[PDB]
């Protein structure tokens, strides 16, 4: 007599009249209903008071979006689970234009007749890098997968081995270069590696001579690049580079003295082609983009599974305009290089703002601390640079039950903990948030 | 001719020539790209003269600075128009895209868990629910779609096909050539036009992966049997849809015969899979439903993940799949301009024919006329529309679109017994405007 006791859809339907909408409700009930069904088929409920209840919360939930925004407080720049690089205004104005209506993507409108949608990136690439050719594809790891199934299906790719660990590329790029449909003729070991072991395992079958970005252990030795364009011109061995970070230029020029790899000195090196992201260090939107000698590109494009690897147009539109300021030199207008550029002494400022709203709240001991900090993300550990964050303790609550509750909210804020501390990186916090910070964190601990 | 190419002006004088006329970055850029030209044309004797020069390096810099990526008006009265763009996305979508993409997300994010998560979550409960498949997934778009499901299931092993399906100029055999480039080993069946049931079971042995059609814009089998074999010798089947239609369309009062993933679940077909941005007037995408298993293999494929898809498309895909739901079909583009009603289109034709009866030399007549509005994709599709039919007395069509093309913003329309034909089922009234606008503007100079 007690699971009959569920009440029929129809019912909730006469409950939610105009409270709600019809089909909205009838999603809630079915999904509340099979629930309720099962936890009193393992017997595990005795009540059907909360029937009513959470069918509601369900409505509740149902209308709002899956996907929300979120205030990021980990100070990673380039977040990877919270969507890397968000885009400026600007490049999302030209976005939403293009995105609203009919366009000129795929149509050259001189010769009135169909074009390639590359068309319209690729000589701001050519510019930039100082390469051949250019192309873009959806992302790096497609990027990747082309330029080794066009240039080597078949035939051998020599790479060190120690290009196939990673935690950062969680063995997802390892793996689709070993179901690339290239054979990978591998090299050295982890941290061992010299020139002469990637000449002795040039042969009949060699297609191409490959090297990726690393990201530990005491020592490594590893090869210049100048040594392996050497080695692939005195062989007729194409030379690949995936830099993977998109970095386009030297960026010694925004104060920041790093060695990293930027497409424009890779290319000017003598690698034959050169690959990165544009979501990370380039604060695009996501694509592959790959550049250099104009044989390779052309053959690469040709590769029929560059279809399916083929950039939608709003990634591209997008891309076009995120080109577009790099080439006005507009960096403060692309959120990525905009934080990383922020300077020591602003970002102390910031943290002091936060701390004077949070005294007023109880059980709170608000602590402000200078930290080196790594905002790359797991993808450039490398990248060493110093953050005031914004320390937090309350008594009766946890930093991990806090922050769980944090992230329940609305909106949501997300933060790294430190030993039982909630802490606040103020390199990836808007001005605009913080009073969003104070509000929904009283309001939260105020019941 | 190297005298004549020593008259080539070096950079710095070109710098000289616009001061602050243009920002020296924009004029360097437009000096390189023409200095470039003209020495070729020099060096293939091609050019013999140096005055049109300076004009056109101007030319150049006006163009550099504007995004080549630009907004265009379609006249065409293709509603699925591939070089304009296919599906356009209604505000509502945009707004909500634009949203996501100026900040930071809950995208790879679970907020639940405190976890990394997969942006799959957020849509897939959505297409389960539409399509009635077990599982979802998305990917770059249905190239990719196809690719990946005969990589994950057949790599090595046999794809049965009809013959028949490697043959189109619409696809324009790129859809084979990828289906070869999969690593599948496809084993062809039947003839172009002669196809049997058992030539399809007389092809399942010990290395059989998968059997999988296409959708055809001659006698073949229907899926029914398909299924049913499939089912026979426990073989996936696979259908490639592509249009990407959600549901069936006589709900619109359209009655065609074209696949929709609902009906193509219903009937029993493992796994299906369309195109994001045709029917579905979404973003580009492809889409993959269907059982669960199928879907669980592709997803863990390492090649997913160089196939998957961005933010924006994804938050884009959210937006359309809600109101989808919602039943909200006047907010999609596509299906707006599709279910347009004749007297519905009359009535825009005339509201512009108005505005251009003060405009002289012009010839304004207002028609109706029957349409393929589908695309080369859906030419089974014929529906009326009222078209704006001009001519001018001094100016030939061919001319006179070609002037449009060169317009800002462009207007793109086709051409009739030399008469401009504007169909209104692809016009915005926010264009008739500019059209009127842009149309004097060239007539009266």
Known sequence: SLLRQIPQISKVVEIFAKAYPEIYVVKAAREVAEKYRKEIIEGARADLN????????????????????????????????????????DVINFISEIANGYSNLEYNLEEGKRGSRI??????????????????????????????????????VIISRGELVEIGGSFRIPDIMKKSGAILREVGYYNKTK??????????????????????????????????????????????????????????????????????????????LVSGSGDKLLGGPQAGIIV??????????????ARALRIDKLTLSGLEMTLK?????????????????????????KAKRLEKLLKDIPGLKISVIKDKAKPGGGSLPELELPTYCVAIRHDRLSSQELSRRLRLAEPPIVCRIREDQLLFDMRTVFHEDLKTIKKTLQELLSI
């Open 195 to 272: 020139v002469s072991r990637y000449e002795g395992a040039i042969n009949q079958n060699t297609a191409l001579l490959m090297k990726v970005h690393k990201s530990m252990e005491g020592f490594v030795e590893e090869v210049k690049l100048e040594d392996l364009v050497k080695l692939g011109h005195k062989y007729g061995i194409p030379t690949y580079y995936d830099a993977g970070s998109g970095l386009l230029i030297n960026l010694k020029e925004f104060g920041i003295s790093v060695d990293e790899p930027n497409f424009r000195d890779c290319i000017s090196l003598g690698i034959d």
């Open 119 to 156: 068309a319209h990136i690729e000589k701001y690439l050519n510019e930039l890098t100082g390469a051949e050719s250019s192309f873009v594809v959806n992302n790096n790891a497609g990027a990747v997968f082309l330029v080794l199934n066009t240039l080597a299906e078949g035939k051998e």
């Open 50 to 89: 909360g029937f009513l209840e959470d069918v509601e919360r369900k409505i509740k939930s149902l209308m709002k979006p899956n996907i929300k925004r979120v205030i990021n407080a980990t100070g990673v720049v380039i977040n990877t689970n919270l969507g890397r690089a968000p885009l400026s205004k």
């Open 292 to 305: 250099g000698k104009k044989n390779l590109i052309e053959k690469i494009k040709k590769n029929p599974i």
């Open 325 to 349: 300021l790099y080439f006005e030199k507009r960096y403060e207008d692309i959120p990525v290089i905009r934080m990383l550029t922020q300077d020591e002494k602003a970002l102390r400022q």
